[PDB]
Every structure is written in C-alpha cells, then in structure tokens.
Amino acid sequence: ELYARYTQAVRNYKSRKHYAVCVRFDNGHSGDGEKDFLRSMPDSIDAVILENAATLNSADLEDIPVLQTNFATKVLFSFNLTSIKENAESSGQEIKTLLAPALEQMVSAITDNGLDGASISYTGDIGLGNNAAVNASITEMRQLLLDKITPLAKNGKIFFLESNPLFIPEANRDVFTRYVLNTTSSKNASQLRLLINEAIYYAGIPSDKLLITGDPELMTTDNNDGLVSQVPFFAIQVIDCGPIGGLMIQNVAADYSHANITYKETRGAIQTLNPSPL
C-alpha cells in the first residue's frame, strides 16, 4: 500500500535529526466540528501536549494510539504546576498536600492511558531570591516533582519544562528533554535573541534542547519593522536566532481553520524548518 509507505516515511522523518514542532491542544471538547479531535493533528508534528489530560474521553483514547503507531507522534500530559502552588496558597495548605496527589494522578494518567510523558508549566518564583522561607518551599516543591518524574524519565518518558530553566538545578537538567521559553510576548527578534542567549550561555541549556513558543493568533515585528504572525516568523527565528531545537505552538486549535488545508501555519512552520526533499 502507498499509505503504509507514507506512514513509514513520516516515522522515518521523525527519527532523523530535525527541528521539532510541538503543539498545545485544547482537547476533550465536543459540539464543535473536526477541530475537537486529536485525529485532526497534522501527521508531521513531533508532539501534542494535551491541555486537559487528567481524565480522557473516548475520542482521545481512540486517537492517541493511532497518532503514536502510525506517525510516531508523541502525546504528553500538561501539568500546571503554577495552579497547584496557587491553590495551596489561597487555601493555606502546604504545597506537598495538593502536589503529591496531583503527581500520582499524572503518573497514573501517563501509565494507564499510554502517554509519552508530560510538559510541566511553572510561572511562579523559582527560589533564586533572598527569602529563606520562600526558598525552602520552592526547593521542596521542586524536589517532589523530580522524585515523581525521574523514574518515568528512565523509562523513556519525555518531559518538557515550560518555565525558566534556572528553576532546575544543574544536577537535574538531564531529566527534561526540552526547555521551553515563553516568547509569546516578545516583540521582535532582538528580544528573542536576548532570551535564547540567556538560556544557553548563562543558564547553560544546550541549544538543541531549547524551544521557543508562538501563538497562531498573535503578531510580532519583523526585521523590516512590519507586522507579521508569530508562528511563521518565530519558525524562521528558531534558526536565525542561533539554531536552537525547535518551536512550540501554544493554542494550536486556533490554527485549525483556513481556506483549504487545516493547521496551515503549523504545517508551514514544519516545511520552513525541515523542507521536504521532494
């Protein structure tokens, strides 16, 4: 079958060296159309992060093994660490109290639903200040996280850190396959270059572990100082702003609808970064 030759080409493409394109998908809805479904993802994305991964409906559980088996697409659990910290604080409970069961849920979700790993997002204080009381609570929160995902990392599970890389002690950097910089508010390539070089040369993140983030609905300013879409411009900047590891597209559902082909900007960023030989 021509089709089996094509899927083998898709899986072969993903095992060769290339710039990664990963997406965050708002899964588990219905009543919209085909855009509700994981099967609508382009065959050539490297990973899809499920926004709502704690309990999965029947559509997602059918689609995930197809994505994995036919296209070697990775499916990751989205873990909002910041949300855990905020609910622990607003209710006066210790982090540990909300964090430990949330972590067992994630591990169980990953194991029972056959997910490929998790993306950890964190936008709170990273324990680099001068308050020892705060700095102790972050250390203990970070330690709980690493105790739970490190055994998964040894089993081949993939972890992204969507946060500041300095959050992770040098001793633990290897637990995360990618470090994802939130650049959706960067206004031009100069600001991109500042953040990338800070990650590499000061935080010590090897450049191929680094992704920047774009949003299909946002704009940024190009080098001619005209206004353009983040995603296609940030795709070029993965290279031009010092070759890093690839691109993360948040809010990818917004990229669903176009004239003819779905996910046009996502497909376009992939072709820009890894042009097909044909």
Side-chain angles (χ1 to χ4, degrees):
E1 181 70 54
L2 174 70
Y3 188 71
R5 277 196 307 286
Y6 159 75
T7 70
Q8 155 186 257
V10 170
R11 298 188 311 272
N12 274 7
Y13 155 68
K14 281 162 194 191
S15 67
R16 299 200 291 288
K17 175 168 161 141
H18 67 283
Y19 300 100
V21 180
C22 304
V23 303
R24 283 183 76 88
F25 178 63
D26 186 7
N27 64 299
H29 303 269
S30 44
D32 317 329
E34 285 303 306
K35 73 185 286 181
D36 280 326
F37 299 129
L38 267 185
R39 68 200 166 84
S40 74
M41 297 295 84
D43 302 339
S44 56
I45 59 161
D46 293 296
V48 57
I49 290 156
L50 305 175
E51 281 281 10
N52 317 290
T55 63
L56 298 180
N57 71 13
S58 313
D60 290 348
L61 292 160
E62 316 203 326
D63 288 342
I64 289 166
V66 176
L67 295 195
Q68 302 170 320
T69 286
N70 284 100
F71 316 109
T73 299
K74 302 306 167 198
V75 189
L76 314 175
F77 183 115
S78 173
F79 192 87
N80 198 333
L81 180 51
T82 318
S83 285
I84 306 310
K85 186 161 159 276
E86 284 179 333
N87 298 339
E89 293 173 353
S90 70
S91 50
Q93 313 183 76
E94 207 167 344
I95 290 297
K96 195 189 166 63
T97 295
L98 297 198
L99 186 47
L103 290 167
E104 282 307 292
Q105 173 173 56
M106 180 182 73
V107 171
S108 290
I110 279 166
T111 312
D112 298 332
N113 294 330
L115 306 183
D116 304 291
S119 179
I120 319 293
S121 53
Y122 182 62
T123 57
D125 174 39
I126 59 171
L128 282 183
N130 53 69
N131 184 335
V134 167
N135 273 30
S137 189
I138 300 166
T139 289
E140 211 263 332
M141 167 195 80
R142 181 216 283 124
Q143 195 58 42
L144 272 160
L145 168 72
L146 292 175
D147 297 352
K148 287 282 160 98
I149 71 183
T150 297
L152 287 176
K154 298 199 201 289
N155 282 337
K157 302 299 165 171
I158 296 162
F159 292 96
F160 293 4
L161 179 77
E162 281 181 80
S163 176
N164 191 314
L166 289 171
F167 179 49
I168 297 315
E170 182 161 341
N172 293 300
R173 293 287 173 72
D174 67 317
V175 171
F176 292 96
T177 312
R178 306 297 183 153
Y179 285 88
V180 183
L181 316 175
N182 190 14
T183 42
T184 56
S185 50
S186 289
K187 277 72 178 173
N188 48 53
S190 290
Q191 210 172 330
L192 287 190
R193 208 175 261 110
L194 193 149
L195 294 162
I196 284 150
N197 283 356
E198 272 189 2
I200 301 169
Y201 298 105
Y202 176 73
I205 300 304
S207 73
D208 67 326
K209 293 179 103 199
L210 217 59
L211 317 179
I212 48 163
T213 311
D215 190 315
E217 295 186 298
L218 296 189
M219 305 288 277
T220 197
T221 315
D222 72 0
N223 290 333
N224 305 317
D225 186 352
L227 206 58
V228 297
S229 295
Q230 279 191 351
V231 169
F233 186 71
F234 282 9
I236 289 149
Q237 304 310 324
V238 167
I239 291 165
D240 289 0
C241 284
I244 58 160
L247 173 67
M248 161 80 75
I249 305 169
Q250 74 175 18
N251 178 38
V252 77
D255 184 43
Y256 173 79
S257 182
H258 299 263
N260 204 8
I261 201 55
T262 56
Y263 292 115
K264 195 169 187 242
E265 286 190 320
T266 303
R267 296 185 205 267
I270 291 161
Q271 170 68 226
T272 296
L273 288 163
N274 317 296
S276 180
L278 300 183

